[PDB]
Structure formats: structure tokens, C-alpha cells
Amino acid sequence: RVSSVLQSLFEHPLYRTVLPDLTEEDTLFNLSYPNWLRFHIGINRYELYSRHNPVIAALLRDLLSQKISSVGMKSGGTQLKLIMSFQNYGQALFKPMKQTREQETPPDFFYFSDFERHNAEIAAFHLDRILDFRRVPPVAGRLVNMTREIRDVTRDKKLWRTFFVSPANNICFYGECSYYCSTEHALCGKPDQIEGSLAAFLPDLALAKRKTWRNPWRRSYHKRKKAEWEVDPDYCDEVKQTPPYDRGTRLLDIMDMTIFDFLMGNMDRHHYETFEKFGNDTFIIHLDNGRGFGKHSHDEMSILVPLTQCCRVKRSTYLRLQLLAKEEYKLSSLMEESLLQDRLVPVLIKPHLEALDRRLRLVLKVLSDCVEKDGFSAVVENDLDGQPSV
Amino acid sequence: SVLQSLFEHPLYRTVLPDLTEEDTLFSYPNWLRFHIGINRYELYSRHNPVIAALLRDLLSQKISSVGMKSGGTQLKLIMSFQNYGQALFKPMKQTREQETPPDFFYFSDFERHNAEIAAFHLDRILDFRRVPPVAGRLVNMTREIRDVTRDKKLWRTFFVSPANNICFYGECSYYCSTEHALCGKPDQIEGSLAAFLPDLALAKRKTWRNPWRRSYHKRKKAEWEVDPDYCDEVKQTPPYDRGTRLLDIMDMTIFDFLMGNMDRHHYETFEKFGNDTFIIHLDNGRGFGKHSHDEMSILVPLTQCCRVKRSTYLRLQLLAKEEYKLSSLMEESLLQDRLVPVLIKPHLEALDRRLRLVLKVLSDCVEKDGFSAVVENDLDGQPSV
């Protein structure tokens, strides 16, 4: 028996935050179901699943071992991403292994040429859960027999067409997308298991409209052309006076996400989604994290710029960030503790967990330098009145 | 409302680059707010309530002066309004049930106002935003045409037909005679007010020849009509191997094929921006003349060049799904003009049938040059699907 670094964290009062009382709204759905459906009705205005909730732990197990019954290909997608639909009518999104565990993105790669890797999708779910955001839909890693579980169970002529046997006698496939869907970029098992991330599926858009927002620090997905925030140091004085960003719980929720993204090095956060039925006053669904954890010896400061320009965070997430730096807690050991509960262990190589620590204290220094320029209270909003003390 | 569902889909939430001091061409009047909103990439915005309100001005603003556009194929009038902004007026030359005869050449075809209107909505549904706004309008040809002109050459052509109806024909070339007059029943004619682009004094326009321009003569075929490898060389000639230009011609040539408009002999740009802007899809009046015939000659630019934008390809596929699809989305927005029905039902169904031919021309072309070689990617950094 061993002591859990993760057990100490979830006992701490900064992780015993209670939500407001939920009315008839704030629920998305009126109301022994499958675990994927119990996850859907558990979605409310503030979070995506809530703390603990043994459904999420058991829903991650369903993604691991439920029989894959049908597979289809998201046509016209960003890169190759598959849709797995299971025996219990719930489905999931599948991103296969594109890069090895030791690899880093080349330095000369643009953010829009980067590979999407299953390690980030998985690890982002755990990192977000450890920061008590609870905004990433649950995702479990899975080894898939790419013959019986991908090719032989699809009636999609375009995904089936790309399966071949390489001169190495391995089974390969690549589908038909835009980035890295060619014979020279095929995905080959050794010889017939490929590995990938099964991301639980958010409720069908028929019964849960989702507003898609532009985020104001969206990069100029062009070379030789900088974006507005890249030239104007007072860019956020103007964004906090623009509609949806002067009323929340919104600039502060973007500061949560933009600290999330910096910790992983994910600079491809050009949009964020909301649940619409709740309005301009709900949380940000942290989706599409596939671009993180590509570089571990490099910290991308561009992502933090929203924080240096806007200069305000939530108090809840500020003290947790400070707690995630204390040696008795701290991202690194708190992350491989959870990340060991996936089948794909190690889902993050040891230098990437080490990079979480270094990037974290850069966030604390950007807040300390920024709290030492606008003063407290102007920088740190207070969402802890009526919450466990410290 | 099927049109409500379309503009919620992410393929219609494309965002622009940040606009610099350039990329801009420049309680105002609505036509002037339309001018200053013209930028490098588009001509308006997906509301932008100015555009919708500019069509109401074209419908019901008081006509203050009318002039005659000299030397045209047919009659076109210049209506200038109470607020000094003007528009181009094309009167009704064809009824709704008529089709262009089969023995007609593309260069003998009439311009009909219903096509000018429907082309604007079709273009807005393809998220192009390249056609100047146009609204349909019934004009009392006494109070709003004859009695408010100081061009005696236009006023002189008003007469009374043996049927006690009010007629006029103007003075152009070849279809401006007593036998081609436009007669109300008894004094309303109906026509299309096409909004006017900014004056060329303060907004120069370069006009380009397109390489698939037909040889506007009988017997003589054009260059691209004999060489199936015509575009192997056209993508190596100056202006067409740098854009966003070949890609913009494929946008325009898919636009034109959908309407059957085979009279696209030239296209204009705004110059102030250079070789790197959008193509203003102007004067689309030759489309929607035939609904029982799909003119494949228009598509040859697509089979020869074999490349589209991914932006417009995915929308083309979307406009084919039964939950969206051109037909119902077109009569919905064509129901918001005064001239209802501006498109007869067989013409809207042909919009669907012609679409599935374009989607077939790309799939046959995407499985022979492959993705990436055929479909350029401009959706990096745009909303996911």
C-alpha cells in the first residue's frame, strides 16, 4: 500500500468547492442508463461532470473494453479522426497514435502544421481534472486491433480503401483527410494494433445546441502576418469592453483556458464552444486538445499573452495553481498518479510531466508580476466567499 | 426555418484575417455604409444588418431621378434616390414561365431581372458575398420612370399601346424598338434594383479577361474548347499562379454553372488591393433562363483545372444534404423579395440537380489527382465541423 499524492489533493478545501443550487434551467436535460448517458444528464451550467461522480470513472472503463461495433470517418476533418459507436448506442471520437512517446514537434513547425497526438487528448483530460476545471469530456486510451476493430467494421468506402500491407508485413491505413493522410504518413501497427484515444462524445447536437466563439487571441494562421494582439500591448483594454467579455465569468474563464493551454503548449486554441441553452453565462468546454504535449524542452510564451495583457484571474484557480506548486501536491507527481490509471502507461513521458512544473511557476510569476502592477483584487476576482477556508 | 439552420452551421462562421489600415478601400445612408464595409476579402458580412436594410431602401425609397445607361445590350436605367445613392435598374424582359429557346446562342440571350435577384441570394447562401445587393421592385412607370427623367431620349419612347397600356422602349442597340417595348398592365412593369458599387473616381476597378471566355461567334470555337490540357498552361500564366485566383475562378465558375450563366466573358477586381482580392460577381442576368437543361460548357474550367477551395467544397457538400440543400434554402430567401416568386419551382430544383453534378465533378477529380492536390486548405484556424 502506498500514499496517493492525488488523495491529499482532493481532501484539500480548495477542492471542496460547492456549486450554487441548480434550478430547472442550469441542467441542459430535464432528466440504470448507460454510463455515456448518465454523463450527459450530469452536464450542468457550471461543470461538465462534477467532482468525483463514479460515472466518469466507469465511463472511462467503458471506452476501454466496450465492443467496437461500427466505425466511421469524419469526412472533411482537420486531420484523421474516427468515430467509434458502441454496443450500448453511445459513441466516442478516436484519434490514433501519430507520433512516438520520445518525439518532439520540430522547432521549424508552425502551430497549424503540428501533429495531433492521442497523448495530449488523454493527458489534457487528467490535467484539467487535477486543476478542478472539469471541462474536458472524459477520454480513455485504448489499444485497438486495427483489423477487426477498424477496417472490418466500417461500411465507409473512403476509410476502408486506405488499408494496405506494407513491405514490412504490417497493417496500415491513413484514411482521407488533409494533413498527414497519405501513403507516406500512414498509421501502421506492429503488426495489427495501432493505439489511440477514445474521447467520450458530448450529447448529440439535436438535443444540445453549442455556440462556437472566436477567441480574441486567435492566431493569424498565416506566416508573414502577425495578429492584432501580437502588435498592440493594450489589446485587452479593448477586449474587456467588447460584448461577451465584460459581463462574466468570461474573461476569467478564458484566463483559465489560456493557462490550461500554456501548461500543455497548445497554441491551436482558435475557438471555444459553449452550451447555448445557458447563454453568455456558462463554462467553456475544453475541446480539441490534440496539439498539446508536442514539445517538452520548450515553453511557448505566446499562449500566456492573454494573461499578461488582461491581468486578471479567478481566486479559486490562482490558489490551486499555488497549491499545485507545493511539493506535497504539485502537478508532476499529481499527474503521473492519475495518468497511471490509463492502459497506455506511460501516457506522458517523464520530461513532459517535468515541463508542467516549470510552466506552472511561469504562470505564478506572470500573476505575481501582474498582481504587483494592477494591485490585488483588481487582478484576483473572488469566487470563494461561502467556500471552505484554507 | 431551414435558412436559420444553415447560418448556425460552423462552415458559415468563417472569420476574416485582421483588417489592416489597407484591406479597406476607404447614421450614414445605408448605401454608403455598404461602400465603406467593402474590404479586400469580401463585399459585405453575414449580417451586417446594413445589407438587409439597404434592400429595403431599394424597394421603397422615393425615386428622385432616372437616367438611361447608354450603349448596352438591352435597356438599363439608373435610379438615384432621395439620399443621393443610386442603383442599376433592369426591367422585366421575360416572364416566369418562359425559357430561353434552345436555338439561342449565349450571346443572343436576354438579361432578366429575376436572375439578377436570385443570383444575389444564391451567392449569399454559398457564403461568397461577391454580388452587389439587389432587391426586386414594382415601379409605377408613370410616376417613377417617365415623369422623373430629364433624358428626352428616354421620355420620347413612352407611348400608349392599342390595348390602352403604358409602354416604353428607350434607346439602346438591337432590342430597343417599338416591337421590344416593355408594357405594364396597365402601368406597372417590375424590375431589379441592383445596388451601385462606389464611383470609379474614388474606387478604381481592374477588369480581367477570363481564360475560358467563349468565342462570341458562331462556327469558331475558343482556345479551351479544343485542348483538354488547357489549364496545365493557364496555371503558369502571370496572375493565375499566385492566388487565390484560380481558386476564385473555380468559385465563380461553380457559381455560374449553377445558374446556367454562360456569359462570363470578363470579371472585375478593386485594384486598390492588387492581384490578391476577391472577384466581384457582377451582371449575372443571363442565368436562370433554362431549367430543363444544364449547360456543361460552363463546368469545363473545373474539369481542366481540378482544384477548389476546401471552404467552398465542404459547403457544396452541405448544400446537398436534405436538411439544408439549395432548393429549400433558395426559395426561403427568395421569399423575402417583393417580386415573389422570383424563381419558379423547376428552376430551384435544377439548382439542386446542377449541384450534384458539381459534387460529382469534384469526386471524380479528387480520385484522379487526390486530395491536397485538388482541394486547397484555407480552413486552418476556422471552426471545426
Q: How far is B293 from chain A (nearest CA, A)?
A: 31
**Catalytic positions of B, written as ranges:** 263
List CB contacts of B341: < 8 A, sequence separation 6 or more: B96, B331, B334, B335
Beta bridge partners of A213: A272
- Residue from the list A78, A181, A228 with its beta carbon closest to the beta carbon of B18: A228
CB contact under 8 A, A270 and B18: no
Give DSSP secondary structure letters for A253-283: HHHHHHHHHHHHT-----EEEE-STTTTSSP
A84 near A162, Cβ under 8 Å? no
Q: Which three cell numbers stand for residue B53?
A: 436594410
Q: Are strands B308-309 and B375-376 parallel, antiparallel or unpaired?
A: parallel
What are the start-end ranges of the E strands in chain B?
A: 63-68, 77-81, 86-91, 134-137, 159-160, 166-168, 182-183, 191-195, 206-209, 266-269, 308-309, 375-376
B-chain CB neighbours of A221 within 8 Å are 380-381
Through-space distance between the first and last CA atoms of chain A, rounded to whole angstroms: 29
Give the closest residue to A4 by CA, choosing from A354, A348, A328, A326.
A328
List CB contacts of A90: < 8 A, sequence separation 6 or more: A34, A35, A36, A37, A62, A201
DSSP character at residue B228? T
CB contact under 8 A, A212 and B13: yes
* Residue A199 parent element (H or E): strand A196-200
CB contact under 8 A, B10 and A112: no
Scanning every residue of chain B, which has its alpha carbon at the shortest distance from the alpha carbon of A287?
B384
Q: Which three cell numbers stand for residue B71?
A: 450603349
| DSSP-based three-state secondary structure for A1 | coil
CB contact under 8 A, B383 and A212: yes
Scanning every residue of chain A, which has its alpha carbon at the shortest distance from the alpha carbon of B311?
A76
Q: How far is B383 from chain A (nearest CA, A)?
A: 7
Scanning every residue of chain A, which has its alpha carbon at the shortest distance from the alpha carbon of B312?
A76
A47 vs B: CB within 8 A: no
B115 near B74, Cβ under 8 Å? no
Q: Could you give the dihedral angle defined by the CA atoms of residues B330, B334, B336 and B339, in that order, rounded to the nearest 10 degrees?
A: -170
Give the closest residue to B209 by CA, choosing from B264, B130, B132.
B264
How far, in Å, CA of A108 to CA of A114, rounded? 10
CB contact under 8 A, A78 and B377: no
Beta bridge partners of B309: B376
A55 near A61, Cβ under 8 Å? no
Q: Which three cell numbers stand for residue A383?
A: 469566487
CB contact under 8 A, B383 and A178: no
Whether the upstream peptide bond of residue A346 has omega within 30° of 0, thus cis, is yes
How far, in Å, CA of A383 to CA of B130, rounded? 48
Scanning every residue of chain A, which has its alpha carbon at the shortest distance from the alpha carbon of B374?
A178
- Residue from the list B10, B310, B317 with its beta carbon closest to the beta carbon of A212: B10
> Which amino acid is present at B274?
G
Alpha helical stretches, state H, B239-299:
246-259
CB contacts < 8 A (A, B): 42
Scanning every residue of chain A, which has its alpha carbon at the shortest distance from the alpha carbon of B377?
A178
Q: Are strands B86-91 and B77-81 parallel, antiparallel or unpaired?
A: antiparallel
How far, in Å, CA of A352 to CA of A345, rounded? 14
List CB contacts of B103: < 8 A, sequence separation 6 or more: none
A277 vs B: CB within 8 A: no
B92 near B191, Cβ under 8 Å? yes
B204 near B222, Cβ under 8 Å? no
A77 vs B: CB within 8 A: yes
**Alpha-carbon separation of residue A353 from A123, A319, A333, A360, B87 (angstroms):** 10, 20, 8, 11, 65
How far, in Å, CA of B81 to CA of B234, rounded? 44
A-chain CB neighbours of B378 within 8 Å are none
- Residue from the list A177, A214, A225 with its beta carbon closest to the beta carbon of B17: A225
| DSSP-based three-state secondary structure for A95 | strand
What are the start-end ranges of the E strands in A52-195?
A: 68-73, 82-86, 91-96, 139-142, 164-165, 171-173, 187-188
| DSSP-based three-state secondary structure for B362 | helix
Distance of CA B8 to the CA centre of its chain: 24
List CB contacts of A204: < 8 A, sequence separation 6 or more: none
Q: CA gyration radius for chain B?
A: 21
Distance of CA B163 to the CA centre of its chain: 35
How far, in Å, CA of A102 to CA of B171, rounded? 79
Q: Could you give the dihedral angle defined by the CA atoms of residues B177, B179, B181 and B185, in that order, rounded to the nearest 10 degrees?
A: 160
Q: Which three cell numbers stand for residue B104?
A: 439561342
**Catalytic positions of A, written as ranges:** 268
Beta bridge partners of B209: B266
A310 near A251, Cβ under 8 Å? yes
How far, in Å, CA of B243 to CA of A383, rounded? 51
B-chain CB neighbours of A177 within 8 Å are 371
B244 vs A: CB within 8 A: no
- Residue from the list A178, A218, A222 with its beta carbon closest to the beta carbon of B372: A178
Give the closest residue to A125 by CA, choosing from A318, A327, A338.
A338
CB count in 10 Å sphere of residue B69: 15
Label each residue of A161-193 as H, E or C: CCCEECCCCCEEECCCCCECCCHHHCEECCCCE
Long-range contacts of B29-35 (CB under 8 A, 24+ apart): B29/B57, B29/B83, B29/B84, B29/B85, B30/B54, B30/B57, B30/B85, B31/B57, B31/B81, B31/B83, B31/B85, B31/B86, B31/B87, B31/B195, B31/B196, B32/B85, B34/B133, B34/B195, B35/B197, B35/B198, B35/B203
A228 vs B: CB within 8 A: yes
- Residue from the list A76, A177, A228 with its beta carbon closest to the beta carbon of B314: A76
**Selected residue of B4, B18, B311 to mutate for chain A interface (largest A Cβ count, 10 A):** B18
DSSP character at residue B321? S
DSSP character at residue A79? B
